[PDB]
């Protein structure tokens with residue numbers, strides 16, 4: 001029976017992986033809350049890895065935030081993520097954990113990358129300023145993995161997810177991520193019966209979204225793939241695998257779909273006097289598809305179920 | 318032997334007309350798929366009308382969609398429908414086709430029209446924003462007909478159907494039309510044995526529904542009526558004829574009837590915290606009834622047969 005440590009099991013992605021691994025007895029979960037184990041503490045982390053018998057590690061712990069947070073607390077974002085990665089990856093190796101899955105991020109790719117973005121797009125150009133500190137910490141995490149794989153013959157894999165959404169997301173008004181922000185706004189506009197909802201921009205830019213449950217499934221899939229199969233579809237110094245749908249949709253389509261899901265009857269209005277971001281941003285998921293994994297949750301279905309979760313848990317935001 | 322061209326013969330309404338005209342040898346059908354004839358291409362359309370010997374035309378081709386589609390692709394909806402109408406109607410005239418039937422839509426009437434909506438309700442007030450582009454294209458199609466009738470002495474008739482349902486409807490999860498959306502939801506809720514099915518709104522608004530086969534019958538009836546009889550019951554600049562049942566029923570009654578048809582045993586729940594649309598929306602079918610046509614398919618019977626079709630074709634959605 002495999003003993004799996006899911007770091008950051010309370011977070012959005014961490015909890016999703018947990019929900020799925022809990023539904024099978026060939027795995028035994030070892031979980032620690034931030035109060036039980038502070039991942040920033042090296043000694044604490046090494047002690048934990050020395051005391052427990054861990055077979056696999058899902059590194060889903062991180063200091064995550066929106067546009068305001070990343071620009072307001074840059075030092076916290078680069079430092080905490082660098083330490084959490086270093087502590088876990090080093091401790092795992094020191095205590096013979098051979099399997100580990102590192103979760104990166106799509107905001108790690110160059111601002112002006114070629115679309116759709118293949119894995120080789122990594123380090124090909126300057127990063128988006130807002131995400132720079134966080135992005136550097138994440139890239140360093142991938143290279144730590146590749147470096148341990150090379151030097152010690154470890155099996156530390158990594159996946160790069162696209163924009164995620166689903167239960168346990170930050171539905172707070174402070175969150176800048178489009179899906180949870182719009183679900184919230186359309187929910188209130190519907191409740192207060194507002195004549196319209198104004199969204200900044202033209203609505204023409206194209207984005208990609210993946211439901212967190214699909215994300216968890218793909219993660220477990222990549223983690224459990226045969227080592228020979230994984231080596232065959234990656235390179236030692238370009239080992240990360242993009243995880244997404246490969247399908248993009250306009251912000252207009254997204255907003256209009258959310259309006260429908262929520263039962264909003266007013267008008268959705270795009271204020272084109274405000275600037276748009278990059279015209280298009282989506283991942284090339286060829287590598288993942290060749291590894292035999294395809295997403296199951298469509299946008300409409302995922303938004304409807306996420307809204308349902310939001311309804312049962314709104315007294316938390 | 319009459320040579321009839323049914324444009325858009327693969328669509329819901331188009332195929333219904335075809336099923337009925339196929340069941341009679343006094344008519345010979347000329348059909349072209351989108352790959353055989355792109356209706357947006359003027360030259361292609363005029364060439365087709367020049368090469369074939371068409372006696373009648375049923376203009377059932379259109380760019381149709383739900384709430385999300387109409388608000389997401391407004392330009393495609395107004396443009397494609399305007400071109401398809403213009404191309405066909407002009408080509409028909411240029412090549413001496415004297416008989417043509419144009420299929421409009423109920424969403425063409427003013428948002429705040431008087432109920433039941435008589436034909437004279439056309440252009441009496443502002444349109445529902447969601448349907449505005451599509452509605453303008455459709456109204457332009459009716460006026461093209463009236464204009465050719467007036468200037469060239471043509472016999473281009475038009476019918477305005479109410480909400481339609483039946484086989485070949487879009488049963489996809491993306492579809493916002495109430496009947497196919499509810500048949501699908503109740504089907505899955507019944508299969509997964511869900512305790513309840515929540516529907517947005519109070520369930521009190523009243524809507525009218527017509528089975529597509531009745532629609533096809535009425536269309537053929539109006540098309541084949543004697544010219545003197547048609548002129549007698551219409552006006553040159555108010556020539557369209559409403560096609561529907563003239564009977565309305567609440568959303569509550571509709572949902573409850575679908576639940577029964579599907580064999581659902583759970584509870585149907587209306588969430589009244591979500592807004593309703595207009596309280597009532599149905600057509601005045603006096604003109605059609607005076608022309609001697611009455612619908613044959615009742616709601617329960619039509620839903621049962623449509624569900625039956627859905628069951629045999631579910632591996633398409």
Ligand SMILES: NC(=O)c1ccc[n+]([C@@H]2O[C@H](COP(=O)([O-])OP(=O)(O)OC[C@H]3O[C@@H](n4cnc5c(N)ncnc54)[C@H](OP(=O)(O)O)[C@@H]3O)[C@@H](O)[C@H]2O)c1
Pocket residue numbers: 007008009010011012013014033034037038039040060061062063064084103104105106107160161162163164
């Ligand atoms: N577009 C994208 O590429 C994208 C989008 C979403 C997520 N992701 C990936 O998923 C990762 C996780 O994101 P998420 O949305 O699941 O965030 P989240 O909900 O904040 O998860 C982070 C978890 O880590 C825990 N944690 C942080 N610092 C800790 C510490 N010092 N000791 C112990 N636990 C600590 C947090 O616990 P507390 O909150 O209890 O402190 C939290 O439960 C990201 O870093 C990213 O790589 C990528």
Ligand SMILES: NC(=O)c1ccc[n+]([C@@H]2O[C@H](COP(=O)([O-])OP(=O)(O)OC[C@H]3O[C@@H](n4cnc5c(N)ncnc54)[C@H](OP(=O)(O)O)[C@@H]3O)[C@@H](O)[C@H]2O)c1
Pocket residue numbers: 324325326327328329330331350351354355356357377378379380381401420421422423424477478479480481
């Ligand atoms: N409530 C209402 O008032 C109501 C409700 C339903 C229908 N209707 C009326 O019925 C009309 C048809 O509706 P429907 O439900 O039958 O839609 P549908 O199933 O989408 O039928 C449209 C057909 O037109 C074809 N088509 C579209 N563009 C074409 C092109 N450029 N070249 C060749 N073929 C083209 C489509 O073929 P492909 O899909 O193969 O491209 C499709 O088979 C509507 O426009 C409306 O006037 C009214």
